[PDB]
């Protein structure tokens, strides 16, 4: 406790302005001379342009939001290889193992990767390529 | 915690005021005019460390000129002749020699005169 030394580069000393001219941040404290931006509390809004019409006011709005929108929890094929062949992969098993904790609106299997095992996979949705890839290794797919 | 400003201001200002000893009136008593006087003295000393060398060279040259005119020469002729003879004695030594040991000065003047 009389020899404490924190890891180097993790702590730096704060900079203080308005403390003499030998530091470089003396009289005007890094602000320059006589403007709106030199005053206390001064400056303009985040997107202000001095009176020219701002960019967002020049382009149109697009679209609408759907209230019945569905989004799925996504599983690709590579992570599905961590299972012993001949098993039955189910949503609950995927929850327990740790591949998925958030079941947004269902489980969808996509076809990015490679499988080298025969499994029966049960899920809410499959892509066409995922179904073909699973069936090409000798497995079966069922829609819950 | 609170830091009250004691004992540092007086120390710094007293050091400045003591650096101004011997100045006229308020300039050795009061901090605000002593500070200005001390800055001015430092600037003057910086410039006069340059002017001192050239003043001494002027003095040496004038003394050598006076010594050489008694030997029927000028400073310019004498310096050119000493260059022609390979003699590398500078102004300081020549003026010292002129004031103190004029016989050796006359010897060197004869050497320069023969070089011409």
């Amino acid at each position: 406790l009389h020899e404490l030394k924190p890891s180097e580069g993790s702590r730096k000393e704060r900079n203080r302005v308005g403390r003499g001219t030998g530091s470089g941040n003396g009289k005007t404290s890094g602000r320059g001379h006589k403007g709106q931006k030199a005053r206390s509390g001064g400056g303009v809004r985040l997107g202000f342009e001095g009176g020219q019409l701002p960019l967002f006011r020049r382009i149109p709005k697009r679209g609408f939001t759907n209230i019945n929108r569905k989004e799925f929890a996504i599983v690709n094929l590579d992570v599905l290889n961590r299972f012993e062949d001949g098993t039955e992969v189910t949503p609950e098993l995927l929850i327990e193992t740790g591949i998925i904790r958030n079941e947004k609106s269902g489980i969808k299997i996509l076809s990015d990767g490679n499988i080298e095992k025969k499994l029966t996979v049960k899920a809410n949705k499959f892509s066409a390529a995922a179904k073909e890839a699973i069936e090409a290794a000798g497995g079966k797919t069922e829609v819950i | 915690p609170r830091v009250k400003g004691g004992t540092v201001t007086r120390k710094r200002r007293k050091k400045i005021v003591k650096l101004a000893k011997g100045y006229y009136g308020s300039k050795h008593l009061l901090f605000k005019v002593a500070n200005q006087a001390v800055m001015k003295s430092y600037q003057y000393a910086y410039r006069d460390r340059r002017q001192k060398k050239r003043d001494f060279r002027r003095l040496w040259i004038a003394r050598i000129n006076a010594a050489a005119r008694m030997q029927d020469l000028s400073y310019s002729k004498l310096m050119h002749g000493l260059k022609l003879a390979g003699i590398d004695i500078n102004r300081k030594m020549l003026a010292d020699l002129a004031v103190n040991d004029i016989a050796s000065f006359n010897t060197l003047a004869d050497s320069a005169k023969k070089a011409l």
């Binding site: 406790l1 404490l4 030394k5 924190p6 890891s7 | -």
Partner: protein, 203 residues
């Protein structure tokens, strides 16, 4: 390690878990955790009054123009004698806490560091019939301690807290309260066997 008895005589040997008492200590982690635990202790009860909380003010001292004085707006402005303070201290909290795994690594590191410097004593038991500081001081003399000490005990240790209370370098803790700041604050660590078993099984 070599076990020993409350009277100081040898009692055999004990093996300590290598996962807890035999790691390579992480010194930077321990320093971070010490600074965190020490910042968490302070209270933060400090305040000043700014120009709106000082009594009085409101009225303009004199007119804006004509009198030959500087323009002023209140008698409680920051450059007036009894006026308000500009920023100053305010009541706040200093406590922060860094993730759980780093804290476990820190306790393991400090405890292994105690083991490496041969500053750890394992003890078979520690009991006293009645509270008696003279007897505890004699016990502390039998084993060569003579300095600040942290005693760590489990249940069935009787009258150890009371007998060690009036001695000033000594602190007794109940084996679930072991912490980095308390270990780093004492030179020697004295542990009973039951307490070291419980410490091993906690982490």
């Amino acid at each position: 390690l070599s076990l020993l008895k409350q009277d100081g005589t040898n009692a055999g040997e004990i093996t300590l878990n290598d996962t807890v008492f035999g790691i390579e200590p992480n010194e930077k982690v321990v320093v971070d955790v010490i600074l965190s635990q020490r910042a968490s202790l302070r209270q933060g009860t400090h305040k000043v009054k700014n120009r709106s909380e000082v009594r009085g003010g409101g009225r303009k001292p004199w007119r804006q123009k004509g009198t030959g004085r500087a323009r002023q707006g209140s008698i409680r402005s920051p450059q007036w004698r009894g006026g308000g303070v500009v920023f100053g201290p305010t009541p706040r909290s200093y406590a922060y806490k860094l993730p759980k795994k780093v804290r476990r690594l820190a306790i393991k590191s400090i405890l292994s560091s105690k083991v490496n410097e041969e500053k750890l004593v394992v003890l078979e038991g520690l009991t006293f019939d009645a509270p008696k500081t003279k007897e505890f001081a004699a016990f502390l003399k039998n084993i060569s301690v003579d300095t600040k000490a942290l005693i760590v005990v489990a249940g069935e240790s009787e009258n150890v807290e009371l007998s060690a209370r009036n001695l000033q370098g000594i602190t007794v803790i109940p084996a679930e309260s072991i912490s980095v700041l308390e270990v780093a604050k004492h030179d020697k660590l004295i542990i009973t066997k039951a307490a070291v078993e419980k410490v091993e099984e906690v982490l």
